[PDB]
Design a protein around this ligand. Sequence first.
Ligand SMILES: Nc1ncnc2c1ncn2[C@@H]1O[C@H](COP(=O)(O)OP(=O)(O)NP(=O)(O)O)[C@@H](O)[C@H]1O
Ligand SMILES: Nc1ncnc2c1ncn2[C@@H]1O[C@H](COP(=O)(O)OP(=O)(O)NP(=O)(O)O)[C@@H](O)[C@H]1O
Ligand SMILES: [Mg+2]
Ligand SMILES: [Mg+2]
Lengths: 242, 242
Amino acid sequence: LQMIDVHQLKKSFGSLEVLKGINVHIREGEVVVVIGPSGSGKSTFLRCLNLLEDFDEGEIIIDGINLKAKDTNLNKVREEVGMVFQRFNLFPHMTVLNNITLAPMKVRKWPREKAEAKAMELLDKVGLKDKAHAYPDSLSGGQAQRVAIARALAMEPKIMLFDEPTSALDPEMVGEVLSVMKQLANEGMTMVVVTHEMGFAREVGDRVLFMDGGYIIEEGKPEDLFDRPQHERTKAFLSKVF
Amino acid sequence: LQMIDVHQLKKSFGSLEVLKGINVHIREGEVVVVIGPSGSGKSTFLRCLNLLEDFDEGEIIIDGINLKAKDTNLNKVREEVGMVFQRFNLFPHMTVLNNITLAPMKVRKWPREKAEAKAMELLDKVGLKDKAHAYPDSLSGGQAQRVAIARALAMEPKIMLFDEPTSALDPEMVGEVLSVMKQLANEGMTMVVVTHEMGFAREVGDRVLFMDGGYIIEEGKPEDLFDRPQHERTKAFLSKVF
Ligand SMILES: Nc1ncnc2c1ncn2[C@@H]1O[C@H](COP(=O)(O)OP(=O)(O)NP(=O)(O)O)[C@@H](O)[C@H]1O
Ligand SMILES: Nc1ncnc2c1ncn2[C@@H]1O[C@H](COP(=O)(O)OP(=O)(O)NP(=O)(O)O)[C@@H](O)[C@H]1O
Ligand SMILES: [Mg+2]
Ligand SMILES: [Mg+2]
């Protein structure tokens, strides 16, 4: 019933315990925003959610399937969780269209015509249908990140992870990437977004999770955490950024 | 006697002819710079060399292998031709190190220990040994492009293709990238470089090809084509990049 469930998740990289046991339970259709200083383990957490990194202690069950359960097919899981990174979301050697159908064809064995019918719909939905036969290098940062999203949505995931999707964009390119995301939030997509775009969080986020030094130090509805933070660390952090 | 041999090379997309027949003969250890306005067919040309695109008429023989030859094995030409793009040169879900070892292991079938060796070297060779375990999102454009080179070098290519490797970099970061390319040239690497960074060409380019609308309008040593261009078009292009 809970789309994403994490119990005392712990993760260490050598002599450094990056995650020190965190608890996260995200309901289906819930949009969760994660914030916090560099090195607080935000990326590591996301990488564990879509089986890109392995964890030490605690357990992660997404959509009711324990990632450590002996039977569970780790690929069905990966297939249902999509991810958009800060950069490097596309293959520069193929067209926008081909970037999008690559996985649906290889992983889902969809015939080309089917994959493309689906790819063009998505592309048309982020306003870049006319970029189908272009290469990534010809796209602005704003168009590329939209293509990146369309590409992840092509696998029709149940979950969508975003690791600083607009962070590396020129300020004017931010808006277009954020509106596509809010629409995703509007259609009930379960979402976890690592971002420091306040506006997006206030208007679309259900909860904000403040991470600092391996722990989720505070959480709450966006309004409450931003305007009336209860923990001294949240305050210090907030005052230093945005 | 010939690393790259291209004859009457013609490429068309639908009813539009992008490469109207070009002839290029590059010898091992040579460095050719390609310049020209948007749509000249520069990228299409590089892609034809790296088996990333197929072609209509004419012929192409890499390191003595005719790509249209029924016999000859293409995918061994692929391993021999490296290529750095303007952007998206890295996998975001992987560590730098892993970005570099991936292909060697997967393609050449190298053992992990071996691959990771070749990787750490190329890394230190580009000034990024301390970042072998970091993720791409943490690299600056310049660092990212350098890792990109290491990643293509790991495969031990006989040829290196560059498509505007510094075009999307802030001015401060172009320098560090051109440098790695300069070294590669001095080490006798057959190179084809699409770049509007005129200095680099004059500094290590044996020849410069000015491309305009499907044809190679003019060419010659850097100093010549740049200081005294014979064609009105070359003269006109250079003026806008003055
Ligand atoms: N192989 C590794 N993978 C991920 N993290 C690592 C690794 N090795 C060391 N670390 C450390 O793990 C800690 C947390 O990393 P991370 O999850 O990327 O923090 P972060 O919040 O995403 N940083 P930023 O992305 O700058 O906010 C950092 O100190 C990393 O240096
Ligand atoms: N499917 C396709 N793949 C690649 N190119 C295509 C395709 N369809 C049409 N084209 C056209 O191929 C022509 C040449 O492109 P290209 O080789 O990238 O020129 P260019 O010099 O690299 N452009 P720029 O990189 O802006 O200088 C362009 O007009 C493209 O629109
Ligand atoms: Mg991060
Ligand atoms: Mg190009």
